[PDB]
Amino acid sequence: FNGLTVLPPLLTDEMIAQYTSALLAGTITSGWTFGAGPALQIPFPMQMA
Amino acid sequence: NQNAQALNTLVKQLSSNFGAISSVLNDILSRLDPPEAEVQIDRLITGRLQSLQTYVTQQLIRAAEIRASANLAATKMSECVLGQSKRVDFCGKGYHL
Amino acid sequence: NQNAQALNTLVKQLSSNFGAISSVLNDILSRLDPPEAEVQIDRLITGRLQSLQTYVTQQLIRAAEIRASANLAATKMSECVLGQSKRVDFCGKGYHL
Amino acid sequence: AYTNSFTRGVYYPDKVFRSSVLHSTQDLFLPFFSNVTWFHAIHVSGTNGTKRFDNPVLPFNDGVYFASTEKSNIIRGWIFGTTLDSKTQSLLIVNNATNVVIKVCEFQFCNDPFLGVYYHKNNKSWMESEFRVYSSANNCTFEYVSQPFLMDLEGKQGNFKNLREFVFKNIDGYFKIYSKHTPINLVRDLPQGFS
Amino acid sequence: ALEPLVDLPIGINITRFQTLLALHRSYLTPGDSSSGWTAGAAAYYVGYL
Amino acid sequence: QVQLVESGGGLVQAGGSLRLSCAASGIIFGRNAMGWYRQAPGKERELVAGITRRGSITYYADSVKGRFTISRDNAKNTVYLQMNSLKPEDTAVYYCAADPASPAPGDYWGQGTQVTVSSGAGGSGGSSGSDGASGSRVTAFSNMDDMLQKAHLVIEGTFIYLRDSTEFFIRVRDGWKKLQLGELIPIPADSPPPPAL
Amino acid sequence: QVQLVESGGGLVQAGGSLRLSCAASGIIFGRNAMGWYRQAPGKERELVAGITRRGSITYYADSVKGRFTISRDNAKNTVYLQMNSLKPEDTAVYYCAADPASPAPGDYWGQGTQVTVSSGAGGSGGSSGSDGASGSRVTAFSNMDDMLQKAHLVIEGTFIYLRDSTEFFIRVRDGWKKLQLGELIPIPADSPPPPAL
Amino acid sequence: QVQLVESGGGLVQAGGSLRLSCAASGIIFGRNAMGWYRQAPGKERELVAGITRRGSITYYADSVKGRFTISRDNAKNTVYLQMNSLKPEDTAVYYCAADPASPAPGDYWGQGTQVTVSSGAGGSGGSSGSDGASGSRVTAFSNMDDMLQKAHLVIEGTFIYLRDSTEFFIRVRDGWKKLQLGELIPIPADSPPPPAL
Amino acid sequence: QPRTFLLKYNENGTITDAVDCALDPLSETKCTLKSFTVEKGIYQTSNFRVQPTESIVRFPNITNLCPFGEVFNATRFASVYAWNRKRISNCVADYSVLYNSASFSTFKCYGVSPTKLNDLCFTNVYADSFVIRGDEVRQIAPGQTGKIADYNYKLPDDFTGCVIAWNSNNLDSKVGGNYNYLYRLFRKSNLKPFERDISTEIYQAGSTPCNGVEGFNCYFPLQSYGFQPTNGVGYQPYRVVVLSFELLHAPATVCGPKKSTNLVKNKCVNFNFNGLTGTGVLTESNKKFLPFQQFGRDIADTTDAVRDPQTLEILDITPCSFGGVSVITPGTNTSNQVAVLYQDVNCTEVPVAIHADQLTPTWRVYSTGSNVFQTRAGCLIGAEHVNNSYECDIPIGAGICASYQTQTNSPRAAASVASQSIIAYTMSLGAENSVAYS
Amino acid sequence: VQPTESIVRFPNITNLCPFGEVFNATRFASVYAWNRKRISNCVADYSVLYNSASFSTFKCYGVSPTKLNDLCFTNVYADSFVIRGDEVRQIAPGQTGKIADYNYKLPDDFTGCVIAWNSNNLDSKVGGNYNYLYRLFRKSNLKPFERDISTEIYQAGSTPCNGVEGFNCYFPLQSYGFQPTNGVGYQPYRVVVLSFELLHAPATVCGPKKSTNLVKNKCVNFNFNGLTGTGVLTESNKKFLPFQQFGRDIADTTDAVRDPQTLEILDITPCSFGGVSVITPGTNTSNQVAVL
Amino acid sequence: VQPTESIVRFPNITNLCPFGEVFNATRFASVYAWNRKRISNCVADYSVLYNSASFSTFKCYGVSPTKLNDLCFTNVYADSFVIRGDEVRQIAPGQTGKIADYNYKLPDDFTGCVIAWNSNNLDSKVGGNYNYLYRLFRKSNLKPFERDISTEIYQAGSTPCNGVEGFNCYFPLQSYGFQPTNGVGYQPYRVVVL
């Protein structure tokens, strides 16, 4: 009780996990082109090629 | 967790009398006569401002380092996930897919 | 703003006593004699030094933040204006041209 | 009812030559938007054709804001003291529509004046205290009292329907009166501006 | 861990010591020990702080 | 401030009046007003009544445990404490101290005087007998027995009172000598009012 | 600093000479210089003259228009203070001293003595302030009147120092103890005998 | 500490014994007992011997031997200091004081006593170990012969006690009072009645 | 009323404007900033701290007077270490000389607050009387070469007692009656504080060079210090009483004359039990205790736990609640709004002072908040939750945000989701953008 | 640029300062109803308080002793009264106890010199302190130079009054006497206060120290109305409220004074300054210096 | 690594240092016109000094209390005098006025021990003495423990001297004695400076 407190972040671990989840979903479906413009559908074997 | 420790350090600095006979200021105000009491409290205000000064500078520097780490992390996100890296062994080891 | 506020804050700290009972360095010199003057001076010197130490310390950190940004800007001048960058989200959003 | 202290009632805490500067200070200022209490000369029976009123003896707590308006100088002054029994030290301020008399001794006031009676053929100026408010065995002392003093206020105005604000407080042992003079159009209003 | 036992403003006289052992019994049978042991409460440790 | 000298008191009945006498250092004695402080739980260190510096406005704490008078005369003043309409609750050991002052047991600003608002008891037998207040002079003892029985740690040349005998004596080589009296002037607070010079 | 005994002075016409009398204190007696101070109730203490020991070398200030002379005996030490060629402007209260000193009414040199030059009357003029009519009648006793009247306004037990006889008197518990009379042995400034003591 | 009270000493012969008496402050009195410090112009100040309370066991340095015995009687609560088997090497100025601490060369504890063994080199009043401290209020001198010194400076208003002859004086304006003290009242034996008030 | 004002002086030194700081959180923003300009965002303007609701004092189990009544008449004034120890018990505290103070010469207290001894109950108090002079009173305090400062008891910081000394010329002698109290100077067997061992040992064998070379441990002195009577002005006596206050488990036997007030649970009170005082909220023991550790002070030098003087319960005491004042306010280029986040509290006890005040209305100038929104960073007052979210504007924390978009008050109004009073909400992570793997 | 001399002024009107009331020890009495004189229009001799720094207690507030020779003030008051030693120390931020804080009190915010000395003599009717009586606590903010007659109870204890009747549940009334020396902390002292008043309007009391009147336009140390500083003195360049003529900057320094000889306001502008940046080659060659 | 022992010294001659006159409490007078004995080539007596564990002032600089037994001196002077309470107060440096500096001051730079205690032996000749004089100003800046007789005046003025005279127009020749119980703070005390 010496005025030593901690506030939570704006984006706490659950919302970080939800943004991560979007990033994962894109990485697989769109490759990198969902953080560089609107999401694309590109088949995963072709992306790999 | 080193923040929790930095805070626990500020709690410990309250066991330090800073050359006073006590670290409780309300007690001094009541127990010691102004010639003694004003000095005893000022020693404690000074010492604590110094302690805080050390806490806050460390936190600020730490924040600068965290920011820089956040910028590395933001870079690995851009360079490794939302794009491919042409930076050698930046995204692991070997040739980045 | 911070340049100016830092300089303004520095000037305003002149109003501090830091446990002395006068801030006016000229009146202390001219109106007080050692039994009192030395006491106030020992306290203003240490106090004021902490504030100066803080001013410089704040400027060193402001300088580091700008130097890093400059090194980053200089990097970007070379990688984004000269030729083409291979980094993404370095040289603006979308695909670097 | 009450009116509010509309971001007014600020006095100079110092006398130093400032220019274009902020300071954060703390002293006995009039708190902003506080309740300022109205008093009226409440009529009581036994009028006797004299227009009889009563007036309590008002608490003084940590310094007061005081203000009044004038139309015909019906207010002859004000008195600061304790029980006002002429067996207790008091400050008597005599306007009597002329020059201010500063006098501190054992005084009383009730709600019934004897020689403080509104001018017609009476007074129109009097530079002495009322002598009908002593009850003897006086013992009082002072070194800073001077009767022909503060003619920079006067107990009479050039024009009427103005408001005079005063703040009475004790700071550093000085009995301080700070005031501001401003017009009003009606006694029901007080300034909406900074004083 | 030793926990407080005594805290009386009496004072101290400790330089040398003896332990108060009742290593006498009222019986005249020397064969019968009840406290005749040299390894009973006769034995104790003394350490240093 | 320490060093109060109390007198008066004694065995009184309820009602009537009782006046206390005192003497003290100028920081107390010379005040135009002194009040009542006493010890004895139930009415403990309470100042419940007093009177103005001039005029006759008598005040009291809303406990109504009497309305007492501070006898003062603004013409070479000392204060006498006059109690009026004593109640059974006004039985205590009393100190004669300035109004904001707080004499109390634990360090004893003097030994006080006993006011008993009933018969019997009193300040160690009817309030007439031994028991001093404090010293003044550079050192003092209390009683004859205080000195005589264990004053052998007293170094030659020491100037000492017995303020329970009023004795003025000096430690000399293997004994004491007395000064005694050369002239006697009556006790303080005799008649402070007409020598208004 | 405290205590210096002054006498001499008086009414002269401009010119002539004037001498003071003084039972000269170690404050000034032992100094390399002992000359004059002067003051007036219109103006604070000022340097007048000092001297260099052995020789004809004296100095005097423009605080006076005189040409005052100081001489000393350097064996069986005594100082000769003689004013010469006094002008009306030299009217003042005089004290014996060197140029530097630490005067104060708290560091009193008594009353000093008044010297008037072509006034044709006694008194202390050339005033702006007060020194009243001195008087007597004080809590820290200055008279016998005080010994009797004010003895009653002090605590029982204190040693009272009478600065006009330099005697101690003793107020005691329930009375007084006056100290006995004795011998009047006059004060020299100095005398050869101390090393034989 | 200072202002110790001693009796005894003077000329004794080698062998035998010499018993000294001493009384002192609680600081000295209450400690082990009182032993001896001694010095002579040919002998360094040293702690001679002491005791750890009465018993057969006492201690002494090998720099200065002697099966010295220290004891306290109950008849009079003082300390008796006995030196046994004295030799001429024991001629010294003695101080009778407890073993912890030691008198400073920049201080002087009590009067002391001189002891000389088989000579006569000591026991001369007015010299060291017969010239020292005792009590006072403001100042004290050893004799009238000494007090005279105040008649050789402008100096008055001194509360004087002749600490070494138990006489009472005031140095007053141009004189000294020569004040009467009454009869000697001898110091009695210790008995505990004082907490009976 | 003494309130802080941010005063504005023009060229002439004339006060042309002023802001009353303890008026509204917006004025506190300006007083904090030391400018009449506020820029859009969140500021820390003050803190809320609950003020005391009660001052709890306790009255004794047994009423009597404390027997101090015999030791200032004439008594034993033993040593400086071995004391005329008198037991004080079963009485109404006569510690009241510290409570209203005197002037003293020594006023040094440790482990107890001297000014609150009539609030505080004790189980046993020993009154230790002695008499010492000026040159010895100085030796009470640590440091400075002396004869008693340097041995045994001084007055340590961890001392449970008060040293009371005052100027009185009453009472002399009787200090030298000690001889059953002696401790070593020179020792080879160590020195334990305050020994009563008068021992027996004999040696001439030293440690450092010994016997004619001013050595150590060449002697076996014993010491026990008294007082020297005053033999000239300057050797001024003072009467010293040390009160050793037993804070240890046992029912109270001594407290002040003031009437018992019992324990007030879940309100901010001023407490003072078994030496432990401070401002805090009383509850009852959840913490495990040893019987020897029934009271606590933590590393922060505040009360942790205390055992109750009248009851058999151990109390857990936690210092009174407080939290940051975070004001959500726009620029001064638009009308100002004031929403306040009251850091880390629920929305049922939102008052600035709970059942107390700061001589100002319960909140600050209001006695109610209104527009109370429970957040994950405390409780937000002046703003209500809406179901219309944004990708934040002014962040509050924990996914909670507010926005002010010239909505003619947004963090200073009631919620609507059908009109532009879109105030505070849990932030959305943008919108979903439909895609399917193919 | 370093100051060339200090400026010490004399006023428009130079007469004698009647400090005698307290330096001749005319009367000490009555702490709140003083025997005093006003010092204005004159050359003061602070001889007593210049050539002595001994006495009994000599503590100046705002100034230290032997400085009064440089400073000018608006008015000076020569005040006197008698209190005890335990009370003398209460003028300074002194001690708690029933010795009280209010028996005059002189914080450094208010310039004054308070000198304790003991030569108590000639002060009549000071033994008992009567004809005035004042409170330790009151509702109208107790300050020195106040007198009160109590009719109401002050009830302000940490534990509430009308029940336990603790601390601040009494009627304070005060009026302090003194009695003669007997021992330590039993000793009276006569107190002289010179109150050095620093207000708007020209300074009127100055010392006898050298006349440097109307020396301007160079770097000097000024001693103007008890305020000091360093700078270059020229005529004021700004408008004023007449009540506020002596400056206080952000640095609590004074930039502005009202002139003691003229009716003008004198502004003090700081002394010439600039950084020195030294450029030098190496030691391969001679060391040439060009200085910016 | 900690020490186990100190280095121990002893002079080349066994004679006890003649601290006699000061010890027997004689010839305490003036404050400049000291009774000074030069102490050299002898065995010190300061073990008992530190062990007396007494004195109102025991203010040492440059030498080491409770370690004085091994601490050798090249010259020891014992200066004995009587000064008043108020002068004893003012012995330490940083006093009020430049007039305190020449009243009596023992700087913190000055090596020695100030031994002062409450003894009141010897009262006369603390200003009666003719060998007791000092200077306030000198054009060659006289420093403390120095006395002289001069024909020449340091004259500067705070107001130019002659015709008009300010402060420091004096012939700077001083001595101050005192008379106790004619005021307060004029009580004598004995002081020894080593």
PDB file of N, CA, C and O in Angstrom, chain J residues 7 10 26 39 57 82 87 93 98-99 165 171 183 191 209 233 279:
ATOM      1  N   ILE J   7      25.791  48.270  -5.424  1.00  0.00           N
ATOM      2  CA  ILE J   7      25.155  49.590  -5.398  1.00  0.00           C
ATOM      3  C   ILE J   7      24.487  49.613  -4.119  1.00  0.00           C
ATOM      4  O   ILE J   7      23.655  48.693  -3.924  1.00  0.00           O
ATOM      5  N   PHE J  10      20.926  55.600  -0.811  1.00  0.00           N
ATOM      6  CA  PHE J  10      20.444  56.401   0.233  1.00  0.00           C
ATOM      7  C   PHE J  10      19.087  56.840  -0.243  1.00  0.00           C
ATOM      8  O   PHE J  10      18.868  57.009  -1.463  1.00  0.00           O
ATOM      9  N   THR J  26      14.851  51.141  26.222  1.00  0.00           N
ATOM     10  CA  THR J  26      13.982  52.096  26.945  1.00  0.00           C
ATOM     11  C   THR J  26      13.018  51.314  27.669  1.00  0.00           C
ATOM     12  O   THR J  26      12.971  51.480  28.872  1.00  0.00           O
ATOM     13  N   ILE J  39      10.719  53.462  11.806  1.00  0.00           N
ATOM     14  CA  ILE J  39      11.923  53.991  11.119  1.00  0.00           C
ATOM     15  C   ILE J  39      11.629  54.120   9.656  1.00  0.00           C
ATOM     16  O   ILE J  39      11.293  53.123   9.041  1.00  0.00           O
ATOM     17  N   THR J  57      21.285  34.937  22.143  1.00  0.00           N
ATOM     18  CA  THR J  57      20.828  34.228  21.056  1.00  0.00           C
ATOM     19  C   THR J  57      20.739  35.354  20.029  1.00  0.00           C
ATOM     20  O   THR J  57      20.114  36.391  20.222  1.00  0.00           O
ATOM     21  N   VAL J  82       9.771  40.916  26.516  1.00  0.00           N
ATOM     22  CA  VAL J  82      10.626  40.017  27.255  1.00  0.00           C
ATOM     23  C   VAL J  82       9.948  38.692  27.283  1.00  0.00           C
ATOM     24  O   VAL J  82       8.689  38.678  27.504  1.00  0.00           O
ATOM     25  N   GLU J  87      11.044  30.003  25.316  1.00  0.00           N
ATOM     26  CA  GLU J  87      10.096  30.717  24.463  1.00  0.00           C
ATOM     27  C   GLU J  87      10.853  31.389  23.383  1.00  0.00           C
ATOM     28  O   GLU J  87      10.160  31.465  22.328  1.00  0.00           O
ATOM     29  N   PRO J  93      11.465  27.839  13.946  1.00  0.00           N
ATOM     30  CA  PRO J  93      10.736  26.598  14.014  1.00  0.00           C
ATOM     31  C   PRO J  93      11.322  25.757  15.090  1.00  0.00           C
ATOM     32  O   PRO J  93      12.237  24.940  14.969  1.00  0.00           O
ATOM     33  N   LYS J  98       3.922  22.795  25.900  1.00  0.00           N
ATOM     34  CA  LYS J  98       2.983  23.780  26.378  1.00  0.00           C
ATOM     35  C   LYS J  98       3.687  25.067  26.527  1.00  0.00           C
ATOM     36  O   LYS J  98       3.125  26.067  26.866  1.00  0.00           O
ATOM     37  N   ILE J  99       4.969  25.092  26.069  1.00  0.00           N
ATOM     38  CA  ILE J  99       5.728  26.357  25.976  1.00  0.00           C
ATOM     39  C   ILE J  99       5.184  27.236  24.877  1.00  0.00           C
ATOM     40  O   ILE J  99       5.464  28.420  24.867  1.00  0.00           O
ATOM     41  N   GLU J 165     -13.188  13.598  26.214  1.00  0.00           N
ATOM     42  CA  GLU J 165     -12.594  14.939  26.508  1.00  0.00           C
ATOM     43  C   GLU J 165     -11.117  14.974  26.610  1.00  0.00           C
ATOM     44  O   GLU J 165     -10.523  15.183  27.687  1.00  0.00           O
ATOM     45  N   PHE J 171     -10.078  25.137  26.595  1.00  0.00           N
ATOM     46  CA  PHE J 171     -10.223  26.543  26.368  1.00  0.00           C
ATOM     47  C   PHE J 171      -8.823  27.094  26.399  1.00  0.00           C
ATOM     48  O   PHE J 171      -8.347  27.330  27.508  1.00  0.00           O
ATOM     49  N   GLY J 183      18.866  28.883  36.969  1.00  0.00           N
ATOM     50  CA  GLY J 183      19.405  27.636  36.540  1.00  0.00           C
ATOM     51  C   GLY J 183      19.258  27.662  35.084  1.00  0.00           C
ATOM     52  O   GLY J 183      18.893  28.745  34.620  1.00  0.00           O
ATOM     53  N   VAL J 191      14.120  40.733  24.336  1.00  0.00           N
ATOM     54  CA  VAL J 191      14.104  40.452  22.947  1.00  0.00           C
ATOM     55  C   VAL J 191      13.881  41.791  22.272  1.00  0.00           C
ATOM     56  O   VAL J 191      12.936  42.476  22.637  1.00  0.00           O
ATOM     57  N   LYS J 209      26.495  52.963   4.498  1.00  0.00           N
ATOM     58  CA  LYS J 209      27.448  52.467   3.599  1.00  0.00           C
ATOM     59  C   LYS J 209      27.368  53.289   2.410  1.00  0.00           C
ATOM     60  O   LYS J 209      26.284  53.764   2.091  1.00  0.00           O
ATOM     61  N   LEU J 233      21.357  47.738 -14.299  1.00  0.00           N
ATOM     62  CA  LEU J 233      20.304  48.546 -13.841  1.00  0.00           C
ATOM     63  C   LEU J 233      19.999  49.605 -14.940  1.00  0.00           C
ATOM     64  O   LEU J 233      20.868  50.307 -15.492  1.00  0.00           O
ATOM     65  N   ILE J 279      38.594  26.489 -30.728  1.00  0.00           N
ATOM     66  CA  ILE J 279      39.144  25.586 -31.720  1.00  0.00           C
ATOM     67  C   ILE J 279      40.639  25.681 -31.835  1.00  0.00           C
ATOM     68  O   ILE J 279      41.196  26.811 -31.923  1.00  0.00           O
TER      69      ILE J 279
END
